[PDB]
Design an enzyme around this catalytic site. Sequence first.
Site, mmCIF file in Angstrom:
data_model
loop_
_atom_site.group_PDB
_atom_site.id
_atom_site.type_symbol
_atom_site.label_atom_id
_atom_site.label_comp_id
_atom_site.label_asym_id
_atom_site.label_seq_id
_atom_site.Cartn_x
_atom_site.Cartn_y
_atom_site.Cartn_z
ATOM 1 N N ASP B 25 69.024 -23.860 49.861
ATOM 2 C CA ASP B 25 68.897 -23.104 49.112
ATOM 3 C C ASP B 25 67.308 -22.286 49.411
ATOM 4 O OD1 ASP B 25 69.252 -20.949 46.767
ATOM 5 O OD2 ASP B 25 69.321 -22.771 45.223
ATOM 6 N N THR B 26 67.073 -21.340 49.621
ATOM 7 C CA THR B 26 66.208 -20.658 50.031
ATOM 8 C C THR B 26 65.887 -19.807 48.264
ATOM 9 O OG1 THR B 26 67.141 -18.521 50.185
ATOM 10 C CG2 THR B 26 66.106 -20.290 52.256
ATOM 11 N N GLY B 27 66.237 -19.663 47.817
ATOM 12 C CA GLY B 27 66.978 -19.091 45.809
ATOM 13 C C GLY B 27 66.112 -19.981 45.325
HETATM 14 C C1 LIG Z 1 68.537 -25.677 41.373
HETATM 15 C C2 LIG Z 1 68.981 -24.150 41.128
HETATM 16 C C3 LIG Z 1 67.678 -23.585 40.538
HETATM 17 C C4 LIG Z 1 66.949 -24.709 40.778
HETATM 18 C C5 LIG Z 1 67.223 -22.245 40.680
HETATM 19 N N1 LIG Z 1 66.076 -21.870 40.018
HETATM 20 C C6 LIG Z 1 64.963 -21.774 40.127
HETATM 21 O O1 LIG Z 1 64.248 -21.844 41.354
HETATM 22 O O2 LIG Z 1 64.528 -21.371 39.275
HETATM 23 C C7 LIG Z 1 62.891 -21.486 39.498
HETATM 24 C C8 LIG Z 1 68.808 -21.447 40.959
HETATM 25 O O3 LIG Z 1 69.050 -21.593 40.030
HETATM 26 N N2 LIG Z 1 68.625 -20.799 41.869
HETATM 27 C C9 LIG Z 1 69.772 -19.290 41.791
HETATM 28 C C10 LIG Z 1 69.092 -18.441 42.668
HETATM 29 C C11 LIG Z 1 67.930 -18.339 41.296
HETATM 30 C C12 LIG Z 1 68.767 -18.006 40.017
HETATM 31 C C13 LIG Z 1 67.414 -17.681 38.406
HETATM 32 C C14 LIG Z 1 66.231 -17.969 39.015
HETATM 33 C C15 LIG Z 1 65.852 -17.892 39.961
HETATM 34 C C16 LIG Z 1 66.720 -18.056 41.027
HETATM 35 C C17 LIG Z 1 70.530 -20.006 43.701
HETATM 36 O O4 LIG Z 1 69.276 -20.218 44.510
HETATM 37 C C18 LIG Z 1 71.070 -21.612 43.509
HETATM 38 C C19 LIG Z 1 72.292 -21.577 42.820
HETATM 39 C C20 LIG Z 1 73.106 -22.688 42.822
HETATM 40 C C21 LIG Z 1 74.428 -23.101 42.492
HETATM 41 C C22 LIG Z 1 75.522 -23.013 43.393
HETATM 42 C C23 LIG Z 1 77.026 -23.143 43.178
HETATM 43 C C24 LIG Z 1 77.025 -22.944 41.116
HETATM 44 C C25 LIG Z 1 75.945 -23.205 40.329
HETATM 45 C C26 LIG Z 1 75.071 -22.834 41.194
HETATM 46 N N3 LIG Z 1 73.032 -19.918 43.435
HETATM 47 C C27 LIG Z 1 73.564 -18.998 42.334
HETATM 48 O O5 LIG Z 1 73.385 -19.358 41.274
HETATM 49 O O6 LIG Z 1 74.726 -18.707 42.831
HETATM 50 C C28 LIG Z 1 75.352 -16.995 41.858
HETATM 51 C C29 LIG Z 1 75.346 -16.063 42.135
HETATM 52 O O7 LIG Z 1 76.000 -16.055 43.222
HETATM 53 C C30 LIG Z 1 77.673 -17.016 42.869
HETATM 54 O O8 LIG Z 1 77.126 -18.377 44.126
HETATM 55 C C31 LIG Z 1 76.862 -19.558 43.519
HETATM 56 C C32 LIG Z 1 77.530 -18.864 42.205
HETATM 57 C C33 LIG Z 1 77.246 -17.677 41.731
#
Ligand SMILES: CC[C@@H](C)[C@H](NC(=O)OC)C(=O)N[C@@H](Cc1ccccc1)[C@@H](O)C[C@H](Cc1ccccc1)NC(=O)O[C@H]1CO[C@H]2OCC[C@H]21
EC number: 3.4.23.16
Lengths: 99, 99
Positions: B25-27
């Site tokens: 996860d690059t995010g």
């Molecule tokens: C561990 C993660 C934290 C550390 C990290 N936050 C961080 O680094 O803050 C500094 C973090 O949340 N990053 C997310 C992007 C993000 C959001 C808010 C602020 C910063 C960055 C993303 O990269 C990962 C999530 C993982 C996930 C996948 C499946 C179910 C629940 C959770 N994907 C996601 O939310 O996706 C949404 C949107 O699309 C849908 O698909 C999947 C679910 C839906």
Amino acid sequence: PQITLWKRPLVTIKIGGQLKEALLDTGADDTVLEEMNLPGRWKPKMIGGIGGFIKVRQYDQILIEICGHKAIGTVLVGPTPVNIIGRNLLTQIGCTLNF
Amino acid sequence: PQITLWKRPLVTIKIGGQLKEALLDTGADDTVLEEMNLPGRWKPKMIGGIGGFIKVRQYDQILIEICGHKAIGTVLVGPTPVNIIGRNLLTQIGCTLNF
Ligand SMILES: CC[C@@H](C)[C@H](NC(=O)OC)C(=O)N[C@@H](Cc1ccccc1)[C@@H](O)C[C@H](Cc1ccccc1)NC(=O)O[C@H]1CO[C@H]2OCC[C@H]21
């Protein structure tokens, strides 16, 4: 290009004629942008994340340009903390992870 | 290898002698794993995402193997719905986004 991950992968996008900064996020199924006025019809939707679920406006077949690459697809708009470009659009621009 | 983004980018990881599946996860700034009993001291932390924050246990200098590539860094443990490998460890295995 090739983007390393020492910093957040932030890029400029153009949507509805407006420029914005957004995070290329391989961990997101969908693209979610902060509250903004987008043209066209929309439907209420809910999307979930690591903290829980939020309410968003789903816009369909919206044109976005991502670092000069065009994509046309679904964009969700709502109270997200950061503009995130998800896999639904990353696939359209030919993005892959390599290591 | 090269990982496409049609499906969630899930890979097998090895941590604390256990094999697990995790999302590249690059995010994600940090790596967060589902609840597991890891030995050693830890510090409490809160991490935020879409929907809000969750409380996690921060472990330091934990060794993880990611598709045969070894990485050592901070690992958070808590009630996450998915095991997530973040940029702090993706940089160590030389991971890039390309398009
Ligand atoms: C561990 C993660 C934290 C550390 C990290 N936050 C961080 O680094 O803050 C500094 C973090 O949340 N990053 C997310 C992007 C993000 C959001 C808010 C602020 C910063 C960055 C993303 O990269 C990962 C999530 C993982 C996930 C996948 C499946 C179910 C629940 C959770 N994907 C996601 O939310 O996706 C949404 C949107 O699309 C849908 O698909 C999947 C679910 C839906």
